[PDB]
Design a protein around this ligand. Structure first.
Ligand SMILES: Nc1ccn([C@H]2C[C@H](O)[C@@H](COP(=O)(O)NP(=O)(O)OP(=O)(O)O)O2)c(=O)n1
Ligand SMILES: [Mn+2]
Ligand SMILES: [Mn+2]
Length: 427
DNA sequence: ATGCTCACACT
DNA sequence: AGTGTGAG
């Protein structure tokens, strides 16, 4: 029986990333309830990142700033930069590259979002397991690590609980067995503290981390003790951990699939899936899903950490909800060129920095009356980094979508535009 | 009437 | 090639 303990995998995720990025630049926002918002003039703007002090009052993402101000009257706000009539995230991307580069010096990372990367420490761990002989791992190596499920058996504040668990774990450590998966997790964890201190020391950003044996468990583990702590989730913590873990909380189970898992099987918690045979799960959700479900509810997941620090695509979009929809064609030309211009500015940076060029341009739109995030995706060739050509070509491949027989108008009105550069190739 | 993204599977 | 799902 292969037991999902071959790998040592960490997920590092920045604590309230956009807020921290603003708080480093505006020190008065530090250690105070703040949020970041986009576009201030509708309802104060929508909230895309919330500090932990603001979360104490009930402030969340997707809220409008004016509503958040009602929960938390003393709340401070930073507005994302605006350029060419639209949001501009350059600041946060550039902060992310800071974090990704540091992480890159320790091991091969898979960038999973603007603020998180997976790292595979299998190799680094065994190299460390030679470097310090066969000597103990002191608690002072894990000053911010929690051991999930510990303490157990026979102090009422959180750091007390942390210590007792870490003491229990370390006391139980089979130092003599460079084979044992729990020892490897521990050594992985020692590396992640170093990795995390390097991030805060070199960027001023704080973050959390999950250390386990696969991408999914490390993701779950990272969120258990946010902010500014890291959590080790061992194979043996899984049964109790999943026994009350709602299905929706596992990566990729938070949408329709997890909902059908709950409806069809009539269960609630991750651990309840172990009841079912693999074929049974493959009966209800297909070969790959039933397989993945069957092994995931036992802590086993085989998705690898992909060596990928650079995005596979560079994209640019703006929504036009309500009466703001675009319904003249000269209006569609202008915003197309607004988007093409930022894309060109970002593509030029990418080729200079990363020795690659995008070869295919994707143009996507939504139209008032449709329901789905995109209403239509079309493609063309990306041959010159010129905003005027990309926008012109973006128009050409969608101009037939105009139902309206009038020359000047555009109906149905367009509720979104999306340009994405892709199919990168070494240059 | 939240925004703006990014990866991936299916077909 | 184009759609849909899941995510931060
Ligand atoms: N729906 C979302 C989710 C995140 N983001 C951006 C801003 C977030 O700060 C940044 C990182 O997202 P996140 O890790 O999911 N949450 P954040 O880092 O803000 O706080 P934590 O909850 O991770 O501490 O992505 C976004 O713009 N739209
Ligand atoms: Mn984060
Ligand atoms: Mn994140």
């Amino acid at each position: 029986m292969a037991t999902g303990q071959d790998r040592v995998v960490a997920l590092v995720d920045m604590d309230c990333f956009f807020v921290q990025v603003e708080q480093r630049q505006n020190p008065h926002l530090r250690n105070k309830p703040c949020a970041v918002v986009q576009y201030k003039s509708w309802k104060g703007g929508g909230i895309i990142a919330v500090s932990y002090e603001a979360r104490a009052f009930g402030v969340t993402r997707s809220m409008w700033a004016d509503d958040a101000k009602k929960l938390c009257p003393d709340l401070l706000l930073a507005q994302v930069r605006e350029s060419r009539g639209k949001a501009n995230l350059t600041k946060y991307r550039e902060a992310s590259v800071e974090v990704m580069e540091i992480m890159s010096r320790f091991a091969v990372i898979e960038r999973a979002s603007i603020d998180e990367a997976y790292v595979d420490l299998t190799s680094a761990v065994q190299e460390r397991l030679q470097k310090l002989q066969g000597q103990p791992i002191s608690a002072d190596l894990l000053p911010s690590t929690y051991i999930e499920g510990l303490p157990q058996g026979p102090t009422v504040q959180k750091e007390g609980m942390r210590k007792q668990g870490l003491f229990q774990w370390l006391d139980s450590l089979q130092i003599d067995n460079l084979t044992s998966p729990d020892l490897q997790l521990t050594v992985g964890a020692v590396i992640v503290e170093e990795m995390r201190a390097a991030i805060e020391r070199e960027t001023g950003f704080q973050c959390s981390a999950g250390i386990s044996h696969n991408k999914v468990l490390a993701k779950l583990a990272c969120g258990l003790n946010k902010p500014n702590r890291q959590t080790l989730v061992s194979h043996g913590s899984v049964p109790q951990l999943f026994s009350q873990m709602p299905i929706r909380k596992i990566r990729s189970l938070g949408g329709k699939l997890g909902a059908s898992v709950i409806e069809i099987l009539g269960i609630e918690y991750m651990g309840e899936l172990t009841q079912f045979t693999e074929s049974q799960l493959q009966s209800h959700f297909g070969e790959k899903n039933g397989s993945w479900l069957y092994a995931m509810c036992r802590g086993i997941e085989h998705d690898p950490v992909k060596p990928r620090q650079l995005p596979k695509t560079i994209g640019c979009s703006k929504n036009f909800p309500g009466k703001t929809a675009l319904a003249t064609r000269e209006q569609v030309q202008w915003w197309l060129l607004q988007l093409a211009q930022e894309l060109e500015e970002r593509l030029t940076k990418d080729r200079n920095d990363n020795d690659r060029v995008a070869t295919q341009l994707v143009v996507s739109i939504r139209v008032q009356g449709d329901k789905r995030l995109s209403s239509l995706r079309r493609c063309c060739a990306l041959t010159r980094y010129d905003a005027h050509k990309m926008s012109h070509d973006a128009f050409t491949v969608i101009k037939n979508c105009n139902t309206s027989g009038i020359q000047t108008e555009w109906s149905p009105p367009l509720t979104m535009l999306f340009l994405c550069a892709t199919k990168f190739s070494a240059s």
